[PDB]
Structure formats: C-alpha cells, structure tokens
Design a protein around this ligand. Structure first.
Ligand SMILES: [Mg+2]
Ligand SMILES: [Mg+2]
Ligand SMILES: [Mg+2]
Ligand SMILES: [Mg+2]
Ligand SMILES: [Mg+2]
Ligand SMILES: [Mg+2]
Ligand SMILES: [Mg+2]
Ligand SMILES: [Mg+2]
Ligand SMILES: [Mg+2]
Ligand SMILES: [Zn+2]
Lengths: 132, 25, 83, 129, 217, 101, 71, 221
RNA sequence: GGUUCGAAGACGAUCAGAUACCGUCGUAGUUCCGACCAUAAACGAUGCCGACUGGCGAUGCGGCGGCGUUAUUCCCAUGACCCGCCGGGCAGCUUCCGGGAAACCAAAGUCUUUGGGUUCCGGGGGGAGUAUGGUUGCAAAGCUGAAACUUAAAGGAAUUGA
C-alpha cells in the first residue's frame, strides 16, 4: 500500500499553488526547489511531497484540477474556452413550429413570420409511461 | 405476571368464593 | 406610535410587507427588500431611481413571492398590462 | 349540520387572513353577516365586499387586507349588561387601546364603544382585532 | 418593459427563442407556474409563453441593474449545463460567479474561506441549487432563478419560465440576460446587434470539443 | 410508538380478511399481512440441464417451469432471510429490489 | 367544557357535580368512611394511654430502629 | 484587543456609517459578531447567569459530563438577549453563552395600559410565547403594578424594561431553558404583532448596502 | 352430521427436572338447523354532523367532452384503450400552512389570538374492575360498582452507551 496522506497531498497542493512558476515535470529539479522553499525536516517526506508535486504538475499542464487555484484558471477561460463557430447554431433557414406554437404566435403580435414551417400535427395521444 | 393469566386466576378465585357463599347460604 | 402628548414614542418603525400587508420582525432573516430600476421611455437606460418592494418570509417559504412581485410590478407599470 | 352561519363565516375569513389571501368567498349570506361586515369595514379591518345573491342564500366576496389578526366569534350569544361589558372586553380583547367586541343591541349591530356611548347592551356576536 | 417599444420583443428574438427551443416545457407542471403556459401539445409537452418569459427576463434585468456595485451580484450554477455560461455572464457584467459546487455555509459561516454576502443572487436551476436558496433564507438577499415547468417556486423572488434542461436554451437565456442588463445601462446601444454570438455560452460536450478539433485538423 | 402507518398489512377498508396458512410452519396470517413470494424455477437449475437436454429424445425440447406461490409468516420469512430489517427512514420505501439477476 | 349551549346549565352543573367525586381528596373529605377510619375523628390532637414501647425498623437503605409508643 | 471586522455590516458599524442599532433590526440584518452590540449598547449592558445545567452523555467510559450555561443579557431599555451554549468547562461555557446572548439581542415594543401619558411602561398587547411545552402569556398592567411573574422570567422582563406586566405560565416551567426561551419568544414577537397604529403605509428607506456600496468596495475588499 | 384439524387425555422423544415447546393417536369443539350467550388488540388504540386551509401521481362508480386505435362488419351506436373535468370512497407521495413532549398528523390544524352543535369518558400508581348491593343468564358469566390499606413514584416520547 502506497497512499499519500493528507499532510503530503495538502502540502503539495499549497506548494504548487504558491510556486507554480518554479515547478515542472522533472522530479529531481523540484525536489531541490521544495527543499529550498519549504522546511521539511525529513528527506523521505520531502521525496513524497516532490513526487506528488510532479504528478499534480502533470495534471495541471494537461488540464484542470479541483484543489489548485493559481492565476492560470483566470486566463485559461479567455484563450481557448472562447471558441465560437463561424455560424451560430441558432441561425437556420427554417424553424419547425407546431400548430399550437403557431397559434400562440398568432395570439402574439408576431403574425407573419417569413422563415417558419408549421409541421404536421402529431396523431395519437400516447405519451405516458406504462405503469410498472 | 401476565394480565391475562392473573385475570383468569382472579376469575377462578371469584368462582371459588361464589361456590363457598352458595354452600354457606 | 403616537402617545397622548403627540410624541412618537417607539424606538423605530418596523417595515411592512407590500404583498402580505404584514409587519416584518427584527429577526425575520427571510424577509427581502428588493429594488427594481426603471428605464427611460425613449433612451432605454437606467434612470437613477428605484421601485422598492418588501416581501415577508412567510410568503417566500410558501412560494407565492414571484406572483406577488409580478402583480406589484404590473401595478406600478414595470410590467406591461397585456403580460 | 350548520348551526351558526355567522360563526363559520368569520372562521373562513380568519383562515384566509392567516394564509394571506387577497379576498375570501363565504357561501351563505345573512343580514347578521352583512351588518357584521359593515361594522368591520367602518373600522377599516376589511376591504370593499360584494354580495352575490341568487334567489337563495347569497354569497359574499370580501376583499381582505393584512390588518386583521383574527376575527373570532362567541357562541352562544350571551346577554351582557353594561356592568359586565368591561369584564367581557377585558377577557376578550388584546388591550384597552384597540380591539372591538361587536354585539347586537336594541339600536342594532354595533361595537362596544358605540354600545357604551348609547348606554345599551344586547346579545354578544363576536370580536375582531 | 411596460408597453415600451424600446424594450419590446423583436422578430430576431423570436427566431432565437424558437431555435433554442426555450418554449418547450417539461412533462409535468408545478401549480405555481401554470400562468406562464398557453397550451399543452399532444405528447404532453407544455408550451412556455415567450412574451411573458421576455417580460420576466426584463424584470430580472431591472433588478440586476438597480444594484449599484456590479461585483456583489452572485450567479450560481452547479450543473455543468450552464457551467461556463454562468461564468462568462458574470465575467461580462462584472458579477462574482461560482462555477459549480456551491459549498454549504458560504453565506452563513463567516469562518469559511469562501464567505461572501452578495446583495442579490441569480441561480440557474432551483431543483439542482436548493442549497443557495435555503442559505438565502438565512441571509436576506433576493433571488432570480430560471425555472422550468417542473421547478418549485420556494424562496425565489423572480422566476423566468424557460427550458432549463436544454443546453442551447440555457445559453441563450443567459446570453440574452447579459445583453439586456448591458443595454439597460450605459454600456451597449440598442440599435446594432451584439457582437458576441449566443453560442459562446452554450455548453460544449467533450465529445463535441474533440469532434471540432478533428474537423479542424 | 406506531411503528408503521399501515401495520404490516394492506387492510384499509375491510377490518378482517381470510387467513392463510404458512408454508414451512402451520401459522395462519392475514392475506395482506403475510409475505408472499411467487417463485418460478426450472425443473433443473444449473448443471443437470445440459446433460438432460443431451439425453432427451426430442431435439430442442424446451424445459418446463414450476410455479410455486409461497406464503411466509413474518417470523418465518425473516428467519429465512426473505426480508431484512431496515433503518427507520428506510422502512417507508416499498419499491421492489432490482432484478438484474 | 364541551357542551356550551345556551340552556345547558343543568347539564353542566350535573356533570360537574358527579365528576368532582372522582377526585380522591374531595371524595375522602365528603365521605364519612374516611372520617370514621381516621383515629382522631377529624381532630388535630387527642389524648391516649401508653401501653408499650416499640422499636420499629426503618425503610430501605436508610435503616434505623426508631422508637414508637403503642397508645 | 482591537476588533477587525469580518462581515459587511461589521465594516460599516466600525466606520460609524450606521449611527444607531435599530437600523439593523429595521433591515433584519443578521448580526454575526459580538463587537457590534457592545459598541452600540455597551454602556448599560448587564449580564446575569440563569442556570448551569450539567448535561451528560453516557459511553463505556461512564458519562462525559459537560456544563450548559444559560445567560440573560441586555440593557434596561428595550433590548434583551438570551444565550444558550454547552461547553466542557464552566468558564468557557459562560464566555460562549454571553456572546451568543449579545448576538441574539432583540428589541421590544412597550405600550400603555389605558391612558397613554408619559413614557411606555407595559406590553402593548396580550402576547404569548411558547417553545416545546411551556407557554408564557404577557398581559398589560397599569403603571406601578410591577412584574407579577415567576423569578426566572421576572429578571428577563426587568432587563427588557417592562416595569409593569402580568404573566400566565402553562406547562412544566421547571425546565429553565424552556422557560427562558418561551418568555424570550413572547417578548421578541411584540414588534411582529400587528397593531392598528402601524396601519400607516411605510416608506421603504435606504438600505445600508445600497447606501454605502461605494464605501464597501473602497475601504475593504 | 363427524373429512381434516384439534383443547382435555394417553404415549414416544428433549431435558438435571418438562406436567410444554417436537412427533403418533385422540373426547368436546371445529360443519349445518333452531334457541341463547353480547365478550375481543370488537384498533384508525383517533366519536357524529357542518365550514375553511397546499399541491402531485393514481384507483373504483357514474356522468360529461374529445384527436386517434382495436372488435360487431356493412356503419350510426355500444364495448376495450387513450386524453381531461365533475361528487364522494379506500388510500399514497412532498412541504417551515398549522399543531404537538415527540413519534407523527390536510388532520391529530383552523386552542391563551382559548366559545359551530352534541353524547360518553380520566384525575398519581396499586388495592380492583376486587368486596358488597342490585339486575340479566341454564351455566360460564355480563352490566353497575366501592372502601379500608400501601407507595414517591408508576408511565409517554426521544437521545447516547451496553
Ligand atoms: Mg376486527
Ligand atoms: Mg424512599
Ligand atoms: Mg414426558
Ligand atoms: Mg425452551
Ligand atoms: Mg391427528
Ligand atoms: Mg362453537
Ligand atoms: Mg370492553
Ligand atoms: Mg379548549
Ligand atoms: Mg387514581
Ligand atoms: Zn410460518
């Protein structure tokens, strides 16, 4: 059983969120980095922290993570999450409208619509799930 | 002591008292 | 609140709900003082004043707060009469 | 069956007040109820009510504000003099500042204040505050 | 909003409503939201009144605009359907969002790290976000919620009748809400159409995302 | 303490129902109160099916099924692990258990 | 009460009259059997004649030999 | 020793943007910190200890006995609070109960019995309060009557400032906590009980948040 | 009339001891007809009549309205379905209406803000539903129904341990 405890995981998370710039995918580099930054009296615990730091760094560089809140999240939304297709899906030549929805549109002041299509009414009032 | 069994016991006790009263009448 | 001498005698006047016509307690944390802005008729922007409503906690937990807000807004002209 | 039409009419109004209804409809209408509603209306505890009558016992639709905490009814209609009227209002009103005990008198249906100023008693109908 | 041609609905708004399908109600109906429905279709799908939906959206926009500070408006959406729409709406209007996972106690427990007391709350779906509503009972702040025909109306102040189930409908409603609140203040004129298309707020499935990347590559 | 709103039975407008005897024991229970199981089972369960089908005179002969409606008393069913006790909040639900196997 | 009719005075009085008997204190006071059973006959004090001195054991764990007089 | 505010209301009250306490009660703002109360009404704030009830829970290690302290606090004019807290030591229990009582301080409404001359003395209306089983009813009394009540709620009423009041107690009033909370509820709902003199259509004044919104975003984060 | 079952009883096991629990027989009874008997956890441990106060899914009866299927066949009309409404009938699901000690209750609410009409019934636990008296009954027993005396607790809900 090789399970990191709360102390290792929590310390790794806060260390990464405080020194995200100085950390990378190389275990040995950040091992010395965390040695200089944080005071860990035991080297075995230091290696545990560095190992989990590298694993979290790989997770961060690949995608989001729940427990880390560096400024990268504040800017990741406006770089690649701002995707917009050239034509919006709501821009369509014809829109299917049921007769009842056409009737309520006639009730509204929107009487004449250029780009609608009144569909054939559905026949057979069978929609409730059979019991049991 | 169950209520039912003590009720039965007192019923027998009443029966014995009634018989004793009847024979002493 | 007025005494016989004509002096306002209570420390403060508690609010009254605009829907239930009921006063609001000092610890009724479910009470809401909501502000609705008005829009210029030709400009279409915020004017600078407000139309304020008060809703008691009892109406909120009952579930008729939205209807009360809708009726008051329609009465004050925020919502169109046709609706 | 229904013994006192006034009693359940007031109870229906009180229930609507507690639930905060805007208006309440009471099925039976009687002269006593109409006088009772007018007495409350002249004191501002209710709104403007309408009487919808067929060729039967009509209905009354009463518009309600939030000022009415409770519109109770006292049964049976005990006979109260001016000597014990103060005791009745002491035991049936929240305080001496407000509250009204409407009781029908020789003059008609009126509250205890008007009953005192006319110096006459009668049958006690109910109370409201 | 009230009998004003400036704030009246436009045909383009009708087209976007129909395209998003926001008029499509749920299978059931709550007794508090029977006044927003015109007729029930065969197959038992309710119809949401678009004009009353738009007017209620206007009222919600008025409430948001009435707040002076734009920062103290909290918008919540725990479900992933509006997860990015709620985030970008606040990023555009200056509100303070919570991108899913509304931790309990954020309004009551002052010792908690995420302790905020906003003036007003805008939640996406009351059924999935009952906890913000219950906390809004303890902390006095009004609530604006997008409620479908199956959504109860407890502890909510303004309910906008819309199909909160459909991702396109949710994105369109938030995009229109952002447009309206920006129009109601000195930010965007009401003549020209808004630059940002409503599809920006639409939920993107990861399968859709890799589909788009495959098409691009 | 009224443990159940309906006292372990479906008696709502009768006041009396015909008792039925238990299967393993001779105890009689009201019809709605008793635990009822309807077990369908092949004549051969796991291993005997393959060899009996191989040894059958008829080719592709479908095996019959035995239909038994067992009635258990409360004590008998619980002793036989037909039903198990649940938490106070978990008593109220009465949907049948899943039937994936 | 429960029957508050306009002319139910006798019913209420009779119900109160025959329900006060169930109070054991009122019944003990108003029945001569208890007064007859009382050695003093409803008297606070009474003179008696000493017969013998009796040492009576006490109740549960608090236990002692109390002194009493057969009078 | 110095107080650093945490809540939005706390920042305003430290900056003295709200001069009086009754504004918080007007807007039903929850008071979450005890430094507001002694800042406002600390001049005549008096505290008394009602009951120390040593509740126990039993485990294999006998019973883990911890003490529950009831605290009655308030100034003798209009404001009173009741604090309940259970802690493992008496000193901490008292220190935690007093702050809860300060947070729970509620204003009261005082009326007149009959004639309305001078300052108010008694309860405006017959008001009832009940928690669990104990029911406490407050009846208006004429001037100089005193607090005709049990000793336990008499001190609470004296702290409430109502120097004339009749009381009726129903139920098992032996339980100090139920008795204290019942009468606390009775004296707290006086301002929520509708009164005919409050029929005037109230005008909604300026909320502290919308009135100092610029200050909130300027003086702190 | 007695098939089966089965008090009482007999027998065989178990048991330190079993007069029982298990098994074999087994009288009355369990079946019917005609007379009594009138007692049950005769329970919803929750009186009858009347008004009001949330929804949601249903169910039984009849009525009403309606796309559309399936039979009579050769179609109006009748069934079986489906979609809603109407009155009460057993009920169920959720809730900060409200209540209560809580368990829970659309009633167990509309109760200190205490009064719709009305019958019965309880005043700490035992003694005791006993004694006596009266009355009914073939009897078993039923109804009405105490006292002397003794005790500081008995009890209800709910929580933590064991
Ligand atoms: Mg029966
Ligand atoms: Mg003792
Ligand atoms: Mg033997
Ligand atoms: Mg044994
Ligand atoms: Mg046999
Ligand atoms: Mg027989
Ligand atoms: Mg009986
Ligand atoms: Mg009563
Ligand atoms: Mg007794
Ligand atoms: Zn059995």
């Amino acid at each position: 059983g090789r399970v990191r405890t709360k102390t290792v995981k929590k310390a790794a998370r806060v260390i990464i969120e405080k020194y995200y710039t100085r950390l990378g995918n190389d275990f040995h580099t950040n091992k010395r980095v965390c040695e200089e930054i944080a005071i860990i009296p035991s080297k075995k615990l230091r290696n545990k922290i560095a190992g989990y730091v590298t694993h979290l760094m790989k997770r961060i560089q690949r995608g989001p993570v729940r427990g880390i809140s560096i400024k990268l999240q504040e800017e990741e939304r406006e770089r690649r999450d701002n995707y917009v297709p050239e034509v919006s899906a709501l821009d369509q030549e014809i829109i299917e409208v049921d007769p009842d929805t056409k009737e309520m549109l006639k009730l509204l002041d929107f009487g004449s619509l250029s780009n609608l299509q009144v569909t054939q009414p559905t026949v057979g009032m069978n929609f409730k799930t059979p019991r049991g | 002591m169950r209520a039912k069994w003590r009720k039965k016991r007192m019923r027998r006790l009443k029966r014995k008292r009634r018989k004793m009263r009847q024979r002493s009448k | 609140m007025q005494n016989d001498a004509g002096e306002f005698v209570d420390l403060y006047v508690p609010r009254k709900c605009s829907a239930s016509n009921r006063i609001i307690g000092a610890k009724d944390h479910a009470s809401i003082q909501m502000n609705v802005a008005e829009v210029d008729k030709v400009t279409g922007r915020f004017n600078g004043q407000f139309k304020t409503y008060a809703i008691c906690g009892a109406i909120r937990r009952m579930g008729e707060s939205d209807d009360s807000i809708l009726r008051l807004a329609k009465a004050d002209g925020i919502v169109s009469k046709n609706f | 069956v229904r013994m006192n039409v006034l009693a359940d009419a007031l109870k229906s109004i009180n229930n609507a007040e507690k639930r905060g209804k805007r208006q309440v409809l009471i099925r039976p209408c009687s002269k006593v109820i109409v006088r009772f509603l007018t007495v409350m209306m002249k004191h501002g505890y209710i709104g403007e009510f309408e009487i919808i009558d067929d060729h039967r016992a009509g209905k009354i639709v009463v518009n309600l504000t939030g000022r009415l905490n409770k519109c109770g009814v006292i049964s049976p209609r005990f006979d109260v003099q001016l000597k014990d009227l103060e005791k009745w209002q002491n035991n049936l009103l929240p305080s001496r500042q407000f509250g009204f005990i409407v009781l029908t008198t020789s003059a008609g249906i009126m509250d205890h204040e008007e009953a005192r100023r006319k110096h006459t008693g009668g049958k006690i109908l109910g109370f409201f505050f | 909003s009230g009998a004003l041609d400036v704030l009246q609905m436009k045909e383009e708004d009708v087209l976007k409503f129909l395209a998003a399908g926001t008029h499509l109600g749920g299978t059931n109906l709550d007794f508090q939201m029977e006044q927003y429905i015109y007729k029930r279709k065969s197959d038992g799908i309710y119809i949401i009144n678009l004009k009353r939906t738009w007017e209620k959206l206007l009222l919600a926009a008025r409430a948001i605009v009435a707040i002076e500070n734009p920062a103290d408006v909290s918008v919540i959406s725990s479900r992933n359907t509006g997860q990015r729409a709620v985030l970008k709406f606040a990023a555009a209007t200056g509100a303070t969002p919570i991108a899913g996972r509304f931790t309990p106690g954020t309004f009551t427990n002052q010792i908690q790290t995420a302790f905020r007391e906003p003036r007003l709350l805008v939640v996406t779906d009351p059924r999935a976000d009952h906890q913000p509503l219950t906390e809004a009972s303890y902390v006095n702040l009004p609530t604006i919620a997008l409620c479908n025909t199956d959504s109860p109306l407890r502890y909510v102040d303004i309910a906008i009748p819309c199909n909160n189930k459909g991702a396109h409908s949710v994105g369109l409603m938030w995009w229109m809400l952002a447009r309206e609140v920006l129009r109601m203040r000195g930010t965007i004129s009401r003549e020209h159409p808004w630059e940002v298309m409503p599809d920006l707020y639409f939920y993107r499935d990861p399968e859709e995302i890799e589909k788009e990347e495959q098409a691009a590559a | 303490t009224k443990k159940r709103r309906n006292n372990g039975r479906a008696k709502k407008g009768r006041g009396h129902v015909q008792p039925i005897r238990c299967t393993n024991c001779a105890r009689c229970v009201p019809k709605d109160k008793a635990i009822k199981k309807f077990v369908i089972r092949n004549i051969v369960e796991a291993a005997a099916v393959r060899d009996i089908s191989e040894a059958s005179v008829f080719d592709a002969y479908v095996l019959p099924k035995l239909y038994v409606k067992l009635h258990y008393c409360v004590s008998c069913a619980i002793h036989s692990k037909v039903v198990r006790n649940r938490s106070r909040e978990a008593r109220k639900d009465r949907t049948p258990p899943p039937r994936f196997r | 009460g429960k029957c508050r009719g306009l002319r139910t005075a006798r019913k209420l009085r009779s119900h109160r009259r025959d329900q006060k008997w169930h109070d054991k204190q009122y019944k003990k006071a108003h029945l001569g059997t208890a007064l007859k059973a009382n050695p003093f006959g409803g008297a606070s004090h009474a003179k008696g004649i000493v017969l013998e001195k009796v040492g009576v054991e006490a109740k549960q764990p608090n236990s002692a030999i109390r002194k009493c007089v057969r009078v | 020793k110095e107080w650093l505010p945490v809540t939005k209301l706390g920042r305003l009250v430290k900056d003295m943007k709200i001069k009086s306490l009754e504004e918080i009660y007007l807007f039903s703002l929850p008071i979450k910190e005890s430094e507001i109360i002694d800042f406002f009404l600390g001049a005549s704030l008096k505290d008394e200890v009602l009951k120390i009830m040593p509740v126990q829970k039993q485990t294999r290690a006998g019973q883990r006995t911890r003490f529950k302290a009831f605290v009655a606090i308030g100034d003798y004019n209009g404001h009173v609070g009741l604090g309940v807290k259970c802690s493992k030591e008496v000193a901490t229990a008292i220190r935690g109960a007093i702050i809860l009582a300060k947070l729970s301080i509620v204003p009261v409404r005082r009326g007149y019995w009959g004639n309305k001359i001078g300052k108010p003395h008694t309860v405006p209306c017959k008001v009832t309060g009940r928690c669990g089983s104990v029911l406490v009813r407050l009846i208006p009394a004429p001037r100089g009557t005193g607090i005709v009540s049990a000793p336990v709620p008499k001190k609470l009423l004296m702290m409430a400032g109502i120097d004339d009041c009749y009381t009726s107690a129903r139920g098992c009033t032996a339980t100090l906590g139920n008795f204290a909370k019942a009468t606390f509820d009775a004296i707290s709902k006086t301002y929520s009980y509708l009164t005919p003199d409050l029929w005037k259509e109230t005008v909604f004044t300026k909320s502290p948040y919308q009135e100092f919104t610029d200050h909130l975003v300027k003086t702190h984060t």
